[PDB]
C-alpha cells in the first residue's frame, strides 16, 4: 500500500470516490440551472448568479475530497459525470425546489459516508466530513428551504412579479 | 482617388454612407423614446435615462463610421434623417419591443455590410465591423430581449406597478 | 424562435453545444492530471498546480460558450462528461505530452466550428471564436510544446532530477 | 477527585500521560536529527532547520496535552524521555524515512486514544484529539511521504546533488 496509508479502509476509499462523483454531478446540475436563468426568455440574472456560485462551490467540495483521498494514501478513480435530469428548469421556484432535493440527496450520501467511517473506526475521516461537509449542507438546506418558502408565499410562479422582486431583493 | 485609398471598393464606401444614416436614424428614434418617458403623464425617469443613453451611443456609432470612411479615403455624403415612426410609444414594454426590433434591423444591415466587405476581399473593413459593431449589437439585442421578458412576466403594461418597479430595480 | 435570434444557424447551435461538452471534458482531464501529481508517490506540487489551473481555465471556456449560446438565442443542451482515458498519467513528461495532444484536439474542433460559421455567413460567431478561442489555443499549444521539449532534453522521466528541477524552475 | 473532574475516566487520564511522553520522545528524536544535519561532514542547513521546527512542534503538542490533563482535572505524571534509537541518521533520505515511521507511530497511538475515549463515552476528549491532533498527523505523514518520494526519484543518497538540491529547493 501507499507509504502514508494508515487506518484507511478500502471501503472508505471507494465511498470517497463515489462522493467525488456526486459533488461533480451537483456542480453540473447547478451549472445547468445557472444557464437556464440566463436565457432571453427567462432573464433572471441574480438567479443565474446564485446557481453559478453554487456550481463553483460544489466543484470546490469535490476538489477537497480529492485532496483528502491523496492525503490518506487512497487513489482517485474518476467516473463519467452524468448530465442533469433536465434542460428546462421551468421557474425560479421549481429550480429552488430541485436544488433543495439535490442538497438533501448529497447530505444523505455524506451521512452514509460518516456511518461507514464510524463503523471502520476512522476518526480522522469522521472529523473531516463533519468539519467541512455536514454543517455546510445543513446551512445550504435551510437557505434553500427559506427561499422556497418565500417564493411560494409571494405567489411564484403564477404571480409575475414574485420571481422578479425576489431576484432583486433576496438574491441581489 | 484619395492618396490614402487602398483596397476600398466604391460599393463599400456607399454602404458605409448608408450605415451612417441608419445609425443617426436609430439615435433619433431613441431620443424620441427618451422624451416620451419624460412626459408628465408617463413619468418614468429611468426609462427616459436608458433611452437617452442609447441615443448617445448610436451617435457615437455613427461618428466612428464617419472616422472610418475618412481613414480609408472615402467621402462622407449625408442624407436627411427621417423622423421616427411614432411620437407616442404607448408603454415601457412597447418601447422596449420597438427598440428590440430596431436593434435587429441595424444588426441585419451590419451583417449585409460584412457580407459585402467579404465579397470585396476587404479584411480591414470586415475586422472593423466585427470589432466595433457586431458584438455590440448581439449584446444590445440580448439585453433588450431580457427586458421584454421581464416586463411581460411582471404583467406590463396592464399591471400598474410593473413598469414602476422595473424602472426602479432594473433600470435604476 | 427566440426573440433575440438573428443569423444563427441550427447547425451552429448544435456545434456550440458539442464544443461546450469538449471544454468540460478537457477541464475534467486536467483535473485528473492535477490529482495524479498530488499523490504521495508522485509528489510534484507545481505540476499539480499547473494542471489545476488549466482545469479551471477550460471551465471558464465552457462557461463563456454557454453565455454565447444564450446571447444568440440558442438553447444549451448538456451531455454526460466522459471520464478521462486514464487514472495514472505515468510521469510529468507523459502528462505534458497528453495535454499537448488534448489541446491540439480542442483546437481542431474550434477550427471546424470556425469553418462552419464561415460557411453559414455568421461573422459574429467567427469573430467570437477568433477573439477568445483561437489565439488562446495557439498560445497553449506552444507553451506545452516548449515544456515537452525542455523535459525531454533534461532527460525526463528516467533522469530522476529532471522533473524535480523542472517543477521548481519552470513551473514554480 | 478534583473539583472540576466530570466524565473523565482514569483510563483516559493514564493514556494522556502516556501520549505526553510519546510527544516528548518525538521532540527529542527530531532534535537528534536536526543536530545530525548540522555536523561539518553532513552540512545540510535546511534539513537541520526542518527537523528543529518539527522538534519544537512536537514540544508544543506535548504541552497542549498537559493543558488538557489539567483542564479535565487529571494529574500529570512524567516519565523518563528515552534517548533516540540512533545518533547517526545516515542521510537526508534515511532521516525522512525514519520521521515518516515515527509520525505513523504517533498517529497509531492517537487512534488508540480516540478509540478509548469513544469507548468511555468522552466526547470532549474525542473532539480534542480530532481538532488538534488527527488532522495534524495526516498532514505531517503526507508531507513526509512526498519528501521521501522526491528524494528517491532524484537519486538520493547515492546521487550527490540530490540532497543538496532538495535542501535548496524544497526545504529552503
Ligand atoms: Fe537548481
Ligand atoms: Zn457539496
Ligand atoms: Zn448602433
Ligand atoms: Zn479550452
Ligand atoms: Zn506530535
Domain definitions of chain C by residue range: 10-170
Please report all neighbours of A, defined by 3+ CB atom pairs within 8 A: B, C, D
Residues of chain C with C-beta less than 8 angstroms from the C-beta of A47: none
Long-range contacts, stretch C154-157, CB < 8 angstroms, 24+ apart: C156/C91, C156/C92, C156/C93, C157/C90, C157/C91, C157/C92, C157/C93, C157/C94
d(CA B133, CA B125): 11
Q: What is the radius of gyration, based on Cα positions, of chain C? A: 18
**Helix (H) or strand (E) segment spanning residue C21:** helix C10-36
Of A2, A63, A66, the CB nearest to C40: A2
Dihedral of CA atoms C60, C66, C70, C72 in degrees, nearest 10, equals 90
Q: Is D58 annotated as a binding residue?
A: yes
> Angle, nearest 10°, between helix axes A45-71 and A160-169?
60
Of A56, A91, A106, nearest to A162 by C-alpha is: A91
Ligand nearest to the CA of D59: 5
Residue A42 distance to chain B (closest CA, Å): 7
Please say whether the beta carbons of D54 and D30 come within 8 A.
Answer: yes
Q: Tell me: cis bond preceding A157? Omega within 30 of 0 counts.
A: yes
Q: How far apart are CA D100 and CA C91, in angstroms?
A: 24
CB-based contact C80 A78, cutoff 8 Å? no
Euclidean distance between CA atoms D147 and D143, whole angstroms: 6
Residue C164: which of D142, D145, D154 has the nearest Cβ? D154
| Cβ pair C165:D165 closer than 8 A | yes
> How many angstroms separate the alpha carbon of residue B172 from the centre of ligand 3?
23
Q: Phi then psi for A81, rounded to 5 degrees?
A: -100, 110
Please report residues of C whose CB lies closer than 8 A to that of D170: 168
Nearest to C122 by CA among B141, B138, B132, B111: B111
Residue B90 among known ligand-binding residues? no
Residues in chain A within 8 Å Cβ distance of B140? none
Instruction: Report the alpha-carbon distance of residue D58 to residue D74 in Å, rounded.
Output: 21
CA of D101 to the centre of ligand 5 (A): 13
Residues 6 or more apart from A25 whose CB is under 8 A from it? Answer: A81, A82
Q: Which residues, including other chains, have CB under 8 Å from residue D30's CB and lie 6 or more apart?
A: D51, D52, D54, D55, D58, D99
3-state secondary structure of C81: strand
CA-nearest of B78, B84, B80, B126 to B102 is B84
Query: From the CA of C62, how far away is ligand 4's center (Å)?
Result: 7
**CA A91 → CA A25, A44, A70, D157, D165, distances in Å?**
21, 10, 40, 65, 60
**Residue in D with minimal Cα distance to A124:** D134
Taking the centre of ligand 1 as the mean of its atom positions, its distance from the CA of residue C49, in whole angstroms, is 20
> Containing H/E element for C23?
helix C10-36
- Nearest residue on chain D to C45, alpha-carbon basis: D146
CA–CA separation, C86 and C136 (whole Å): 26
* Residue A120 CB neighbours (<10 A): 17
Phi and psi dihedrals of D83, rounded to 5? -70, 150
CB contacts of A3 in chain D (<8 Å) are 100, 145, 148-149
Q: How far is CA B89 from CA A122, B82, B163, D56, in A?
A: 71, 17, 14, 78
- Cβ <8 Å between A35 and C84: no
If you measure from the C-alpha of residue A170 to the centroid of ligand 2, how many angstroms do you get, rounded to a whole number?
22
Report the residue of D115, D119, D133, D138 to disrupt the A interface, i.e. the one with the largest count of A CBs within 10 Å. Answer: D138
**Spatial distance between the Cα atoms of A42 and A94, rounded to a whole number of angstroms:** 13
**Touching, D vs B (3+ Cβ pairs under 8 A):** no
The alpha carbon of D17 and the centre of ligand 5 are apart by a number of angstroms equal to 14
Resolution of the model in angstroms: 1.7
Neighbouring C-alpha atoms within 13 Å toward the C-beta of A107:
15
Nearest to A76 among C59, C80, C87 (CB): C87
Q: What experiment produced this structure?
A: cryo-EM
Please indicate whether, in this complex, the C-beta atoms of A28 and C79 are within 8 angstroms of each other: no
Complete DSSP assignment for D130-156: IIIIIHHHHHHHHHHHHHHHHHHHHTT
Task: Answer for the pair C94, C148: CB distance below 8 angstroms, yes or no.
Answer: no
B–A contact (≥3 CB pairs within 8 Å)? yes
Cα(D54) to centroid(ligand 5), Å: 8
| Contacts with D84 (C-beta within 8 Å, 6 or more apart), sequence order | D28, D29, D32
How many residue pairs from chains C and D have C-beta atoms closer than 8 A? Answer: 38
Q: Do residues C67 and C16 lie in contact, with contact meaning Cβ atoms separated by under 8 Å?
A: no
CA distance D119 to D113: 10
SS3 D167: helix
Contact status, residue B116 vs residue B12, Cβ threshold 8 Å? yes
**In chain B, which residue's Cα lies nearest the Cα of A160?**
B154
Buried b (16+ CB within 10 A) or exposed e, B118-137: bebebeebbebbbeebbebb
CA distance C5 to chain D (A): 54
- Are D165 and C163 in contact (CB < 8 Å)? no
**Ordered DSSP codes for A31-80:** HHHHHHTTSTTT--HHHHHHHHHHHHHHHHHHHHHHHHHHHTT-------
Is D149 within 8 Å of C43 when comparing Cβ atoms?
Answer: yes
Choose the mutation target among C123, C129, C130, C131 for the interface with B, i.e. most B CBs under 10 Å.
C123
A102 CA to centre of own chain: 7
Among the partner-chain residues B115, B135, B142, the one whose CB lies closest to the CB of C4 is: B142
**Domain A10-170, CATH class in plain words:** mainly alpha
Distance between CA atoms of residues A76 and B45, nearest Å: 58
Within chain B, where are the H helices? 10-36, 45-71, 92-119, 123-129, 135-154, 160-169
The nearest CA of chain C is from the CA of A153 a distance in Å of 30
Per DSSP, A145 falls in state: H
Q: Which residues pair with C81 in a beta bridge?
A: A81
CA of residue B22 to ligand 2 center, whole Å: 52
Amino acid at each position: 500500500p501507499s507509504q502514508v496509508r494508515q487506518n484507511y479502509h478500502q471501503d472508505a476509499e471507494a465511498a470517497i470516490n463515489r462522493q467525488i462523483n456526486l459533488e461533480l454531478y451537483a456542480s453540473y446540475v447547478y451549472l445547468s440551472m445557472s444557464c437556464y436563468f440566463d436565457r432571453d426568455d427567462v432573464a433572471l440574472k441574480n438567479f443565474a448568479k446564485y446557481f453559478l456560485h453554487q456550481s463553483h462551490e460544489e466543484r470546490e467540495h469535490a476538489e477537497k475530497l480529492m485532496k483528502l483521498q491523496n492525503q490518506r494514501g487512497g487513489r482517485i478513480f474518476l467516473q463519467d459525470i452524468k448530465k442533469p435530469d433536465r434542460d428546462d428548469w421551468e421557474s425560479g421556484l421549481n429550480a429552488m425546489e430541485c436544488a433543495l432535493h439535490l442538497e438533501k440527496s448529497v447530505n444523505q450520501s455524506l451521512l452514509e459516508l460518516h456511518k461507514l467511517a464510524t463503523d471502520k473506526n476512522d476518526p480522522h475521516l469522521c472529523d473531516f466530513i463533519e468539519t467541512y461537509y455536514l454543517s455546510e449542507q445543513v446551512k445550504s438546506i435551510k437557505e434553500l428551504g427559506d427561499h422556497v418558502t418565500n417564493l411560494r408565499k409571494m405567489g411564484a410562479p403564477e404571480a409575475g412579479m414574485a420571481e422578479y422582486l425576489f431576484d432583486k431583493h433576496t438574491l441581489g
